[PDB]
Amino acid sequence: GLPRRIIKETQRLLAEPVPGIKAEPDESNARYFHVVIAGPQDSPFEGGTFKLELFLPEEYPMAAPKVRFMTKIYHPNVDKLGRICLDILKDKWSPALQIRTVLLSIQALLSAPNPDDPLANDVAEQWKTNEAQAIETARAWTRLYAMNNI
Amino acid sequence: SGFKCPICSKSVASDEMEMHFIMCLSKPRLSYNDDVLTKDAGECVICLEELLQGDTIARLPCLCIYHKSCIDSWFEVNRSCPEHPAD
Ligand SMILES: [Zn+2]
Ligand SMILES: [Zn+2]
Ligand SMILES: [Zn+2]
Numbered sequence: 286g287l288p289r290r291i292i293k294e295t296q297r298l299l300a301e302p303v304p305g306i307k308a309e310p311d312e313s314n315a316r317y318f319h320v321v322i323a324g325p326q327d328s329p330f331e332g333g334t335f336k337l338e339l340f341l342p343e344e345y346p347m348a349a350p351k352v353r354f355m356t357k358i359y360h361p362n363v364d365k366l367g368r369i370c371l372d373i374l375k376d377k378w379s380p381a382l383q384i385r386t387v388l389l390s391i392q393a394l395l396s397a398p399n400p401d402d403p404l405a406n407d408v409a410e411q412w413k414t415n416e417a418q419a420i421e422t423a424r425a426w427t428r429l430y431a432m433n434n435i
Numbered sequence: 436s437g438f439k440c441p442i443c444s445k446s447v448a449s450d451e452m453e454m455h456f457i458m459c460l461s462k463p464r465l466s467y468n469d470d471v472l473t474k475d476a477g478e479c480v481i482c483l484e485e486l487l488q489g490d491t492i493a494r495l496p497c498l499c500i501y502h503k504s505c506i507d508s509w510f511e512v513n514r515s516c517p518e519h520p521a522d
Contacts, residue, residue, distance in 0.1 A: 303453070303457075304457060305460070325460050326460070326461075327462075327463045373438070379438075379449070381438075381449035382438070382449060382452075385453060386438075386449065386452045386453055386456075389452070389453060389456040389457070389460075390441075390456070392456070392460060393440060393441050393442050393456050393459065393460060394441055396441070396442050396459075396460060396464075397441040397442045397464070399441065
């Protein structure tokens with residue numbers, strides 16, 4: 286059964302949604318949430334609607350939600366499998382955080398990418414060596430994959 | 436300590452996080468213009484090294500100047516002008 290914390294978070298997401306973020310529980314397994322995050326204004330992701338899947342592990346809130354992008358996105362902290370390199374999803378998880386603040390943290394990461402994270406990837410390299418072109422590629426991918434995809 | 440906003444680097448409590456992050460997502464964050472210093476301008480207030488002609492500098496909207504490296508380091512912990520912390 287769902288612990289009361291999950292029931293409360295779910296009801297508060299329904300009653301008080303986060304601006305710019307859609308988050309609804311899956312109909313079959315209520316530990317899964319289907320998420321749409323609006324691309325932050327004045328980022329290369331502006332105007333995009335990015336689908337994500339969030340899962341609450343059995344140990345939640347002692348373990349972080351597992352979150353991945355389901356929409357292709359060009360971002361130094363999102364790999365080709367949609368996995369997100371974000372400290373609060375790993376070493377810096379705290380049970381004071383909730384679904385709504387985890388999703389806001391991801392949205393804020395879209396606004397302020399971190400290409401300096403130790404894990405070495407090609408997108409972060411592009412962001413550091415040719416930021417203008419990387420931003421334009423992120424814009425192109427937003428218009429190809431994150432518009433009219435909902 | 437608390438939870439660090441990636442947009443402005445400020446740390447906030449968990450119960451301030453939602454309204455803070457929404458605010459930082461609502462408007463462009465503080466920025467600067469890259470420039471090459473055209474003439475000596477005294478000491479950079481961050482590192483205390485001279486701002487010399489040719490230096491790789493940042494000019495903020497309040498008109499303050501710093502070495503690009505210095506303001507970038509400060510922006511990692513608080514995205515604000517050292518001289519104009521409340522703009
Ligand atoms: Zn902030
Ligand atoms: Zn300096
Ligand atoms: Zn200033």
